[PDB]
Structure formats: structure tokens, C-alpha cells
């Protein structure tokens, strides 16, 4: 009945996936840019590419180990550059 | 041992496997 008619709006958007954007009728190209940001923050394009071919578990583990090291290495590099800049500012 | 030296053992193992397959085949026909 009408009870099943007036409660469909929330219901429709209650089962969201999180991969949708409400288009800005003024700047419609800014909404597509927002959608692209979601894809990159959920690694959707990367995951899809990584699922095209099978990789042996040992190789997967090696790649995961190396990637983590590079991520951690970059954080250590940035920490040292900040110290350099701070030291330079104070005249060291 | 290095890969280079391992390769000599690899060849010897390959030839033994090749010879045992050949012997097996003969037994099947001769049997």
C-alpha cells in the first residue's frame, strides 16, 4: 500500500554501495573527478588489474614485502628531509 | 654451490631421467 510507497526513498538509498556520486548540475566534471578519487582511495583500478592473471603465493608474498619496505623507506626519507629543512632554517 | 655448478648436476639428473624413461618404454614393448 502507500506505506510501501512513502518508505521507498530511504530504502532505495539505504542499500548504498559507496561508489556513487550525486552530480553537480552546475559543474558536472567535478562529480566525475570525485568518483575517480573514490576509485583510487579504494584501490578499485589496481585490484582489477591485479586480478587479471594468477600469481603464485610465494611471488605475492615477495611483492607485498617489497612494497611495504618501499612505503616505510619513503616515510623515513621524508622524516630526514624535514630535519634537514628545520636544521637549515635554524642555521645549522 | 653456485647456479653455474648446479647446472652440471641438473644435466646429469636429466640424462638419468631420460634413460630411465627410455628403459621403461622398452620393457612395455618387450613385455
Amino acid at each position: 500500500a502507500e506505506i510501501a510507497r512513502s518508505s521507498v526513498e530511504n530504502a532505495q538509498m539505504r542499500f548504498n554501495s559507496g561508489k556513487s556520486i550525486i552530480v553537480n548540475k552546475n559543474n558536472p566534471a567535478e562529480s566525475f573527478k570525485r568518483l575517480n578519487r573514490i576509485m583510487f582511495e579504494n584501490n578499485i583500478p589496481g585490484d582489477k588489474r591485479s586480478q587479471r592473471f594468477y600469481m603464485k603465493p610465494g611471488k605475492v608474498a615477495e611483492l607485498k614485502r617489497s612494497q611495504r619496505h618501499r612505503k616505510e623507506f619513503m616515510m623515513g626519507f621524508k622524516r630526514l628531509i624535514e630535519i634537514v629543512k628545520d636544521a637549515k632554517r635554524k642555521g645549522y | 654451490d653456485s647456479v653455474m655448478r648446479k647446472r652440471k648436476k641438473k644435466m646429469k639428473k636429466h640424462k638419468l631421467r631420460k634413460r630411465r624413461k627410455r628403459e621403461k618404454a622398452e620393457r612395455r614393448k618387450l613385455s
Binding site: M75, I81, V84, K85, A87, K88 | -
Partner: protein, 92 residues
């Protein structure tokens, strides 16, 4: 508590491509505005008169104006000068 990541001893501390702030050309921004002014009010519209006059002066002698903002980063000079002091390496 914020995880500090300490690098191993390194042969160098260097930024591969130091980022520099390249101020925009004044003549190119003038041209980008005039071109937009013609897109809305029309080509040769009296509303873009000032833009045309300014653009002509900017490009009169050099089409890109007097470009005198060239800069190079000094992070690699300081990074190599201070690395041995600030890397926290144990004594010999």
C-alpha cells in the same frame, strides 16, 4: 607513539627531482583571460578592450614577457652537507 621509521646507513641523501614553485607567466594568464572574455561576451566585444590593451603591452617585446624567475632547489646541497650530522649513526 607516532611510528618513527629510521633508515639504514645510506650512500647518499638526495631528492631525484626537487620540486620548485614556477610562477605563472603574466602574459599567458592575460591571454587565457582575454580568450575567455571573447568566449562569453564575444570576439572583439567592447568589454574585453582592457584585456586586449594589457595583452599587447605584456607581449609587445617578448611574447612571454621578461621571464626572470628561474630558480633551482638547494635541498640536495643541504641534504648532503647535513646528512652525516643528523642521521643518528652510532660512533665508530
Amino acid at each position: 607513539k607516532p611510528p618513527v621509521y629510521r633508515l639504514p646507513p645510506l650512500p647518499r641523501l638526495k631528492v631525484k627531482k626537487p620540486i620548485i614553485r614556477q610562477e605563472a607567466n603574466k602574459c599567458l594568464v592575460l591571454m587565457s583571460n582575454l580568450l575567455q572574455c571573447w568566449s562569453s561576451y564575444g570576439h572583439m566585444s567592447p568589454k574585453c578592450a582592457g584585456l586586449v590593451t594589457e595583452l599587447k603591452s605584456c607581449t609587445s617585446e617578448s611574447a612571454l614577457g621578461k621571464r626572470n624567475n628561474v630558480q633551482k632547489s638547494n635541498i640536495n646541497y643541504h641534504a648532503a652537507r647535513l646528512y652525516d650530522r643528523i642521521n643518528g649513526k652510532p660512533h665508530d
